[PDB]
Design a protein around this nucleic acid. Structure first.
Ligand SMILES: [Mg+2]
Ligand SMILES: [Zn+2]
Lengths: 718, 1316
RNA sequence: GGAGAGGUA
């Protein structure tokens, strides 16, 4: 009665049931502000009952609790106005069942609705990871006063915009508003009313609504940007841009201080996310939230106007698919014939078949995409021209609403090679997309693949839950509990290299972590930053332009505070743009942030320098061989290719006894093979010239005279 | 060619493959297994007879007497089905067996009879099976799913190098009996051989060898070849076997026949063996050094001293050779050993064996099996004998023997049900052989190794394990003396058998409640093939290899239909055509392909026999002769696919749709979707709530009628005839002349079940689908059940859908629903709830149901009559009184809050010895009257039928039509007639009439007795009153309706019709889905279905317009014919010229709502014919039309897609989910709010939510949320007081649950307390 | 109150 999930500790002692609660299904209702949610009448009148009693007795409509309970029970029409009176400014908490990260439980204001389903603002669905296909959500009410204020000032939805895992915004317009905006900011080469000139955005809006000009056609319009490059002073500057009426209409929504070029491109999903991020980082918070709401409204409206539907004619099969597949078939047949006669071995036949099938698949995919993304050829009032296609599926895929290019490949081109259960790859791919029909066997194989995927997701989530529960129970007791430990040890933050390109630059690894020892610009003895400053965006720019290479940064692994870590050692809160407040639980948020993505994971020669720049070697103990090259006699020798600036750009691991064309501090041409070695066998490399004497090398009991037989030179094996 | 009743609505059919084997009865595996369970089988190998003949006879220990079995019998069920469902008692049947006790004479020799006595002892109650295939246990009809457990026999399994970290595999061999103790042989990393019994401690196998009385030399002679050494004048000339030299080198100079065959240090080539055999060498001189590392075969003794020079199985030494030569042992036998051919795996185990004789080995076994309990001389031998070789405790079934002999390359497929020395020896031989390289391990997912065990077999085995107990009891009883006065009644006890069967049927892991909210749900639940249960594998600790789909599943178990979530791949469903073999494996049909002709004869193949032949799959083009038009035909040879010649094939599949289950065979355009999305589509198709009036699906897969009529809901005729009188409740058919028996003329009569609750509270009723004068034929459909339409399944409604985003109201997956969908009332569903109220017999006396209750106004009592029970038909609402009960010192039943509806039926049961109040008497009298009237009506129906028959036979040979009518019917049946068989028929009919009169006059009495009697009841209850509410759940924002392609969504708003998009004709659409959902979730089936439905409704609309204005048949005939044409060589070929020129009119009438279209799953209609059909109507061939917005009135650019789609309303309403709680009850042990909606419980602030709140800075809210809102009793009372007084604060205190933990942990020896 | 089965996210 103590152990296990059924024991007291994990059942009735850490998480209890609770009064004042409710549960329901959720629908969308996109007319809500960002800081409120719908609430059914019945749930509202059942949750808040004690407050209704209080108001009734205060107002003298029931001089006891029994009469008041009767009045509530049969709800005379008076109680509804009282209920609305109680709700005025009383937040509630909405929660979803598998609440992984800190954003899973959020506050809201309630708005009474004559329905039976909790309406939820459509932007926060991303934070909840809440599809509307039947998900249920639970409602709690905070009773005391301090609870109400805590809800309002910590969990009200307009205070959680940046995810604690990383600064990235978490209310990115998700999947439909993005399609609307992308279809809004485009340009057909020749649409209705092309070339005229307008006197500002609202004029363009009126023109479009009157129907004289299509939603996207090139047009010169005069716009007045605002720039606050001064000391917090907005300066208005007008100009005559050349854009499309869609973009001009959209500009009417954005707040004051943003450059116009931010709403000039095609506005995919990534562009919208970046736009929100810049708006937040320039104009505080309130403008950002109001702007996000307006973005959602306009996006929905113009997407609805678009009528972007999907049809079976909008899945174009490239005209060369059959020829490609037939040629690949003949290519397979020739190798099959080769192995019939024994000219080749089974393994090589198999590998060649797989390789050529992969080549055919890639060719088909490329041909399909090329015929799909530019098929539009339309005259430009002259003879002919081509532009980005309006094919519906492509318009949905490119914008980023739904589905990568892989799904388009599976819908139009052949759907690749399918793998049998035990990890092997079937030598015969599926040569049929979904616009055409799969026959029996192909469908069978696809079925196996899908079932493997499903079972893997089930087991993977089951395990990830245990992982996160373990993690949060080793870091739960850590709480930033000082202001400054007063130390100097940190760690050397540098961009990460894997042999190839930079997988992560420096500006995204030290963004928001205090420095340990003031960096010296590469004008050495030029103090660029103080030693205990927060490296926010401006200092990051200063580092970037001066091409800083490696920075000493105070890290939470060496802070000297006891029973907690000091404020500076941690860095920036990362969920709101300022240093961490004293007295904050960071261990729990760290554990949850590492455990949340746990379900998106999967369960089961010669150096070719590719950039012009100087070459430097670390830990070189080398000599010059007979060919004049450089032969290394150390193991930890590492080569760095540095650009003209003096900042490292590439790294490579040099095996022992590897010959190098260059020496040290030379210049390498792009694509130059700079070194080579024999990774197969190990030599007995010497150091200097002379005679080589076999000491203590006696045939018969110490070695064997295994003289070479195919050639006949001297050979003896220890 | 077309039946009359089949011309009401001919479903236009696509498809090209001619079906060659129509689908079989869909419930064979239940109605046949249980049919074999209870039958007089003289062969004595199926069902009960086998069990009885297996346990009996029983011989006493002396044995001066024995008890032997004779025969059995099943009585008449006490209650028929309807009564059993009403009351709640098992629909069972008594089981009477005629045992027979025989008494010998002690002094006379063994075998003699003093006197023998027998009687018919009662024992047990075996539940019976309704017609459909569902048992009734306690008014809660359940179904038993089949099991998929690993078959008895032998398996040579292996581990894939997941032990010893050495990369060395370890083969093991298991013998699995059908009932008894298992057996295992395993290889230790050191190449030993270990036996293991029932997963107890290990043992060297040589001991179990010795158990069978085997000597060391015997074992060695069994398991090895013998090399012979000849002590001669010259150092061991040795007799050589040529095969030895293969794969080995020479350590010395093999030189014989005066020729150096080879020198030392050289590997021996096949050329060396070839030259040796050419020279025909038999003996070679071998240096003594070769025998250095050898081991003797049999013990060698010194002749003179009689001592043992060298015991068997030991190495050789030079001094041992000297002693041999001194003793003159010419012939020396030694082992044949090699590191790859013959590993000496036995000798090492011999060495490990600490035992040498039979007694010690038996003692070792006895000690291992029973720790402690010092063994005796007889204990070990008795244990072994009755463990592995007594037919009463170890039994390989017939299937076991068959599989066993098939796995050892034997010839006989029948033998003994026990083991024998040769069996164990052969298993060891085969295991060693596998270790040496020949042979192959066996995988376990092969469908040739897993057995289907349907309901009959499991119930029979439970019955046998019941019988064993009474057998033991009677054996120990007869062991006693005093047999002169026994009877076979006191020793036989009915409680054990009844318990052993009832517990299985009523509460097991394979007798589960039958969800019944469809025909499809029933059908697909009776065919389920589970892998869990007793003897199977656990749900939560099953690996991954089990869940995957094996290549052998093709055509036996559906691969796409499976309940996702915690248990994938353990609840797979049976495929459409799959049969069950004789033993129990799964078979599938194929068409025999002769030399070059695809014939029509079909063979059913098993899972193993498929692995040998070559099968060309279903869709291979052939032209009227069985010749494959192409010459490189696709085939599945053996666990893989390839292309083969036109002559190498040996079998071809039956139909395209033998791969999928029945549940997933109803999806049109199945071949276009993904896999997992079709999976969700099926699993949601299973949950469609029946609607108020069903509607056919515009685009089906032709597999509807089979599911409709092969389930039980529709009332399918049994003998074709003419409808005589239809009605809302019953039907009468005058049977045709041919299909009538000579006597007992009669006329068929059907009764229809009106509104009665299903198991999920969805009303099921039947409506007639015929009218007066309509002919009908055998097997035709007469009464449509829930969600059926002219006898073809119809779960949901087909509605006009347009794909386009609409002001975000369909953001993620939501659905925008126009208001016509609810105005026309075409989704409302009727639900029926049963509410009970019991009158317990408690302290302070009992309590009653008097209509008077305290402190309530007469207003709430207006709906109760004088007795205290609501009237039939009162329209109650939320919070009312249905029956008024009294607190003995107000426990009156009340309607659950939120539900409305009308009371439609009331029942009351009273325990014997209690006077029955007014309402009960009223209901009893009403039932009496109803039964009498019903019986009278049916009697006169049959009597009129009989007299019509008599008039028919009188007018043949002596008709006087006038005379018959003059004298009334009462005196017809003795009129004169010429002498022939006609007089015989007249006499037979008169006899039948009298018999019918007697039958009725006694059946009325039987029904009276059944009604007026008392009622059995549970102890403590005096009377129970049940009331049925009927509700009409209409539709709300929040319900969850879904398509057939797994595109579920939560309806989100009910727009007024004037706001919905409308095309230029003026017809506003009725749904607005979200286009964004297609590309990411690849299921194009929905879009293709939308286009096809659009074409179908276009044709329907054209016909409707043609009929609106009066158009003579001349035009309808033409147009309908041309419509049924226009395929790509379809197989339909329906000819309108043969219709009666009035069936054409009725066909047009039934087609005016759209021409139904068929599309077999994997042989469907391609794009081209869809385009052609669309162009047949005047619709735009592109499929997309141009709409107009409702509010603005301006046009949408980008023409959108609109068509007709079939949608179902799933059984996840909103009003069964929405819930709230402010202050309710409280648990008992730990003061926390209760849980669940049944009780008025609150939600659970789970652990992860506590973490989340800690992640914020929020501390006060968390502290209150787990101190004052749930647990701290004084805290929450004061909180309530403060809140009422309008002063928000709290008084935290300490949780009560913590005190519970403190006391509980202090209940151990631990002293834990709180310090200062 | 506890078990068993099925279902939803
Ligand atoms: Mg969901
Ligand atoms: Zn610190």
């Amino acid at each position: 009665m103590i152990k296990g999930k059924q024991g007291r500790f994990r059942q009735n002692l850490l998480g209890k049931r609770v009064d004042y609660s409710g549960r329901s299904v959720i629908t969308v209702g996109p007319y809500l502000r960002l800081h409120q949610c719908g609430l059914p009448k019945k749930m509202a009148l059942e949750l808040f009952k004690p407050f209704i009693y209080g108001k009734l007795e205060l107002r003298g409509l029931a001089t006891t609790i029994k009469a008041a309970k009767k009045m509530v029970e049969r709800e005379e029409a008076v109680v509804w106005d009282i209920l609305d009176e109680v709700i005025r400014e009383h937040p509630v908490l909405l929660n979803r069942a598998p609440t992984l990260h800190r954003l899973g439980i959020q506050a809201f204001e309630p708005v009474l609705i004559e329905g039976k389903a909790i309406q939820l603002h459509p932007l926060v669905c991303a934070a909840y990871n809440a599809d509307f296909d039947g998900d249920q959500m639970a409602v709690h009410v905070p009773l005391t006063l301090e609870a109400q204020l805590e809800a309002r000032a910590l969990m009200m939805s307009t205070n959680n915009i940046l995810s604690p895992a990383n600064g990235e915004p978490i209310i990115v317009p998700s999947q439909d508003v993005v399609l609307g905006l992308y279809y809004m900011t485009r340009d057909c080469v020749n649409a209705k009313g092309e070339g005229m000139v307008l006197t500002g955005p609202k004029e363009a809006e009126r023109l479009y609504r009157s129907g004289l000009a299509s939603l996207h056609a090139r047009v010169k319009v005069r716009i007045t940007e605002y720039e606050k490059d001064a000391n917090g002073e907005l300066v208005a500057k007008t100009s005559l841009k050349d854009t499309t009426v869609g973009r001009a209409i959209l500009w009417m929504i954005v707040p004051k201080g943003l450059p116009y070029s931010i709403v000039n491109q095609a506005l995919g999903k990534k562009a919208i996310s970046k736009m929100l991020n810049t708006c937040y980082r320039i104009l505080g918070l309130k403008p950002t939230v109001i702007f996000a709401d307006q973005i959602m409204y306009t996006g929905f409206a113009y997407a609805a106007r678009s009528g972007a539907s999907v049809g079976i004619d909008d899945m174009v099969i490239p005209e060369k698919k059959h020829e490609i597949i037939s040629e690949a078939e003949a290519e397979v047949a020739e190798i099959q014939e080769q192995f019939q006669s024994g000219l080749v071995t089974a393994g090589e036949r198999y590998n060649k078949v797989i390789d050529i099938w992969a080549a055919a698949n890639d060719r088909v995919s490329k041909a399909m995409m090329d015929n799909l993304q530019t098929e539009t050829v339309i005259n430009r009032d002259g003879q002919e021209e081509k532009q980005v296609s309006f094919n519906s599926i492509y318009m949905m895929a490119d914008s980023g609403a739904r589905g990568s290019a892989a799904q388009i490949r599976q819908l139009a081109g052949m759907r690749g090679l399918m793998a049998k259960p035990d990890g092997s790859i079937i030598e015969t791919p599926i040569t049929a997309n979904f616009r055409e029909g799969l026959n029996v066997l192909q469908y069978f194989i696809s079925t196996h693949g899908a079932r493997k995927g499903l079972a893997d997701t089930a087991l993977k989530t089951a395990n990830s839950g245990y992982l996160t529960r373990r993690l949060v129970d080793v870091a739960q007791d850590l709480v930033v509990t000082e202001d400054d430990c007063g130390t100097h040890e940190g760690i050397m933050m540098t961009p990460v290299i894997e042999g190839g390109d930079v997988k992560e630059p420096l500006r995204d690894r030290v963004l928001g972590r205090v420095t340990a020892e003031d960096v010296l610009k590469p004008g050495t003895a030029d103090i660029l930053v103080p030693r205990n400053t927060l490296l926010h965006e401006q200092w990051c720019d200063l580092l970037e332009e001066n091409s800083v290479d490696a920075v000493k940064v105070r890290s939470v692994v060496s802070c000297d505070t006891d029973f907690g870590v000091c404020a500076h050692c941690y860095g920036r809160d990362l969920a709101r743009g300022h240093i961490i407040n004293k007295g904050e639980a960071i261990g729990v948020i760290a554990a949850q942030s590492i455990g949340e993505p746990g379900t998106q994971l999967t369960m089961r020669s010669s150096i070719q320098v590719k950039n012009k720049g100087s070459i430097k070697l670390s830990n070189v103990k080398s000599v010059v061989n007979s060919s004049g090259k450089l032969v290394i006699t150390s193991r930890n020798t590492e080569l760095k290719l540095i650009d003209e600036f003096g900042r490292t750009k590439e790294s490579y691991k040099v095996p022992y006894g590897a010959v190098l064309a260059k020496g040290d501090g030379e210049q390498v041409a792009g694509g130059e093979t700079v070194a080579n070695w024999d990774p197969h066998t190990m030599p007995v490399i010497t150091e200097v010239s002379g005679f080589v004497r076999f000491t203590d090398m006696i045939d018969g009991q110490t070695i064997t005279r295994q003289t070479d037989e195919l050639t006949g030179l001297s050979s003896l094996v220890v | 060619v077309y039946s009359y009743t089949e011309k009401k609505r001919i479903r236009k059919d696509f498809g090209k493959r001619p079906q060659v084997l129509d689908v079989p009865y869909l419930l064979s595996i239940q109605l046949d297994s249980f049919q074999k369970f209870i039958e007089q089988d003289p062969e004595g190998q199926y069902g009960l007879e086998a069990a009885f003949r297996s346990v009996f006879p029983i011989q006493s220990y002396s044995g001066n007497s024995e008890l032997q079995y004779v025969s059995y019998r099943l009585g008449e069920p006490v209650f028929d089905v309807q009564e059993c469902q009403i009351r709640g008692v098992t629909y069972s049947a008594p089981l009477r067996v005629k045992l027979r006790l025989v008494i010998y004479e002690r002094e006379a020799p063994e075998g003699t009879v003093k006197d023998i006595k027998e009687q018919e002892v009662y024992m047990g109650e075996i539940p019976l099976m309704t017609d459909n295939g569902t048992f009734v246990i306690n008014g809660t009809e359940r179904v038993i799913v089949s099991q998929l457990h690993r078959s008895p026999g032998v398996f040579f399994d292996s581990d894939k190098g997941k032990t010893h970290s050495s990369g060395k595999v370890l083969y093991n061999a298991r013998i699995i009996p059908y009932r008894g103790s298992w057996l295992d042989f395993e290889f230790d990393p050191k190449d030993n051989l270990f036996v293991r019994i029932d997963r107890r401690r290990k043992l060297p196998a040589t001991i179990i060898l010795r158990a069978l009385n085997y000597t060391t030399e015997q074992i060695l002679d069994l398991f090895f070849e013998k090399v012979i050494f000849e002590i001669r004048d010259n150092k061991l000339q040795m007799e050589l076997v040529p095969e030895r030299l293969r794969g080995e080198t020479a350590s010395f100079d093999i030189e014989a026949n005066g020729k150096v065959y080879v020198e030392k240090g050289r590997r021996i080539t096949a050329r060396h063996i070839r030259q040796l055999e050419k020279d025909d060498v038999k003996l070679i001189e071998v240096p003594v050094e070769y025998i250095a590392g050898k081991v003797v075969a049999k013990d060698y003794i010194d002749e003179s001293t009689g001592e043992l020079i060298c015991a068997a199985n030991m190495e050789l030494s030079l001094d041992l050779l000297a002693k041999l030569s001194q003793s003159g042992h010419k012939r020396i036998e030694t082992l044949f050993t090699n590191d790859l051919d013959h590993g000496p795996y036995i000798s090492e185990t011999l060495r490990v064996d600490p035992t040498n004789d039979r007694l010690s080995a038996l003692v070792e076994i006895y000690r291992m099996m029973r720790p402690g309990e010092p063994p005796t001389r007889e204990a070990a031998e008795s244990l072994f004998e009755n463990l592995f070789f007594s037919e009463d405790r170890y039994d390989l079934s017939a299937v076991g023997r068959m599989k066993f002999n098939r796995s050892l390359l034997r010839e006989e497929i029948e033998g003994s049900g026990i083991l024998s020395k040769d069996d164990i020896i052969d298993v060891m031989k085969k295991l060693i052989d596998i270790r040496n390289g020949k042979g192959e391990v066996d995988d376990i997912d092969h469908l040739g190794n897993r057995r289907i065990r349907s309901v009959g077999e499991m119930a029979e085995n439970q019955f046998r394990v019941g019988l064993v107990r009474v057998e033991r009891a009677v054996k120990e009883r007869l062991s006693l003396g005093d047999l002169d006065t026994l009877m076979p009644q006191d020793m036989i006890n009915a409680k054990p058998i009844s318990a052993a069967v009832k517990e299985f049927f009523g509460s097991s892991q394979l007798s589960q409640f039958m969800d019944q909210n469809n025909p499809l749900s029933e059908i697909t639940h009776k065919r389920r093939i589970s892998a869990l249960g007793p003897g199977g594998l656990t749900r939560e600790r099953a690996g991954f290899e089990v869940r995957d789909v094996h290549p052998t599943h093709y055509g036996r178990v559906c691969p796409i239909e499976t309940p996702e979530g915690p248990n994938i791949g353990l609840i797979n469903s049976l495929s459409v055509y799959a049969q069950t073999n004789e033993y129990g494996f799964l078979e599938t049909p194929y068409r025999k392909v002769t030399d070059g002709v695809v014939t029509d004869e079909i063979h059913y193949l098993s899972a193993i026999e498929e692995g040998n032949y070559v099968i060309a799959q279903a869709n291979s083009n052939l032209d009227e002769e069985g010749h494959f038009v192409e010459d490189l035909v696709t085939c599945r040879s053996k666990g893989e696919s390839s292309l083969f010649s036109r002559d190498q094939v040996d079998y071809m599949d039956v139909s395209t749709q033998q791969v999928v289950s029945v549940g997933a065979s109803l999806i049109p355009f199945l071949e276009h979707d993904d896999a997992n999305r079709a999976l969700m589509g099926a699993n949601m198709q299973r949950q469609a709530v029946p609607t108020l009036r069903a509607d056919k699906p515009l685009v089906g897969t032709g597999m509807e009628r089979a599911v409709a009529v092969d389930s039980g809901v529709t009332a399918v005729a049994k003998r074709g005839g003419v409808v005589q009188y239809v009605d809302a409740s019953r039907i009468v058919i005058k049977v045709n002349e041919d299909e009538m028996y000579p006597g007992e003329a009669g006329i068929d009569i059907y009764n229809l079940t009106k509104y009665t609750r299903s198991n999920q509270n969805t009303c099921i009723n039947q409506m007639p689908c015929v009218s007066l004068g309509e002919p009908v034929e055998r097997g035709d459909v007469l009464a449509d059940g829930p969600s059926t339409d002219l006898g073809e399944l119809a779960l949901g409604q087909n509605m006009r859908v347009a794909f386009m985003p609409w002001n975000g109201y369909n953001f993620e997956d939501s659905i925008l629903v126009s208001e016509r969908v609810v105005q026309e009332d075409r989704f409302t569903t009727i639900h029926i709830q049963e509410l009970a109220c019991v009158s317990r017999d408690t302290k302070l006396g009992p309590e009653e149901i008097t209509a008077d209750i305290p402190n309530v106004g007469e207003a709430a009592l207006s709906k109760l009559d004088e007795s205290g029970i609501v009237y039939i038909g009162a329209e109650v609402t939320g919070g009312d009184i249905l029956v008024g009960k009294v607190t003995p010192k107000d426990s009156s039943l009340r309607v659950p809050n939120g539900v409305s509806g009308t009371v439609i039926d009331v029942q009351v049961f009273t325990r014997d010895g209690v006077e029955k109040d007014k309402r009960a008497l009223e209901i009893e009298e009403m039932q009496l009257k109803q039964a009498k009237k019903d019986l009278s009506e049916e009697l006169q129906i049959l009597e009129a039928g009989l007299f019509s028959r008599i008039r028919a036979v009188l007018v043949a040979g002596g008709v006087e039509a006038e005379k018959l009518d003059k004298l009334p019917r009462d005196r017809w049946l003795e009129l004169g007639l010429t002498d022939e068989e006609k007089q015989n028929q007249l006499e037979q009919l008169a006899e039948q009439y009298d018999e019918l009169k007697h039958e009725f006059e006694k059946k009325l009495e039987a029904k009276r007795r059944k009604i007026t009697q008392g009622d059995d009841l549970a102890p403590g209850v005096l009377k129970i009153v049940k009331v049925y509410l009927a509700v009409k759940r209409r539709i709300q924002p929040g319900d969850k309706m879904a398509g057939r392609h797994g595109n579920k969504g939560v309806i989100s708003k009910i727009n007024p019709i004037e706001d919905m998009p409308y095309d230029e004709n003026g017809t506003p659409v009725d749904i607005v889905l979200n286009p964004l959902g297609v590309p990411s979730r690849m299921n194009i089936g929905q879009i293709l279905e939308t286009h096809l439905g659009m074409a179908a409704k276009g044709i329907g609309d054209k016909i409707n317009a043609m009929l609106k204005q009066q158009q003579e048949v001349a035009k309808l005939r033409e147009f309908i014919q041309r419509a049924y044409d226009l395929g790509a060589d379809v197989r339909q070929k329906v000819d309108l010229s043969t219709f009666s020129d009035e069936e054409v009119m009725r066909l047009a009438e039934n087609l005016r709502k759209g021409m139904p279209i068929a599309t077999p799953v994997f042989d469907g209609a391609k794009e081209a014919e869809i385009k052609e059909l669309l162009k047949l109507g005047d619709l735009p061939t592109s499929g997309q039309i141009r709409l107009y917005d409702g509010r603005t009135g301006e046009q949408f650019e980008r023409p959108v897609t609109v068509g007709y789609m079939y949608m179902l309303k799933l059984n996840h309403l909103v009003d069964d989910k929405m819930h709230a709680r402010s202050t309710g009850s409280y648990s008992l042990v730990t003061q926390q709010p209760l849980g669940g909606k049944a009780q008025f419980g609150g939600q659970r602030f789970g652990e992860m939510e506590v973490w989340a709140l800690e992640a914020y800075g929020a501390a006060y809210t968390l502290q209150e949320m787990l101190t004052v809102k749930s647990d701290d009793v004084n805290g929450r009372t004061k909180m309530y007081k403060n809140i009422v007084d309008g002063n928000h604060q709290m008084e935290p205190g300490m949780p009560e649950s913590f005190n519970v933990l403190l006391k509980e942990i202090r209940s151990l020896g631990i002293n834990i307390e709180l310090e200062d």
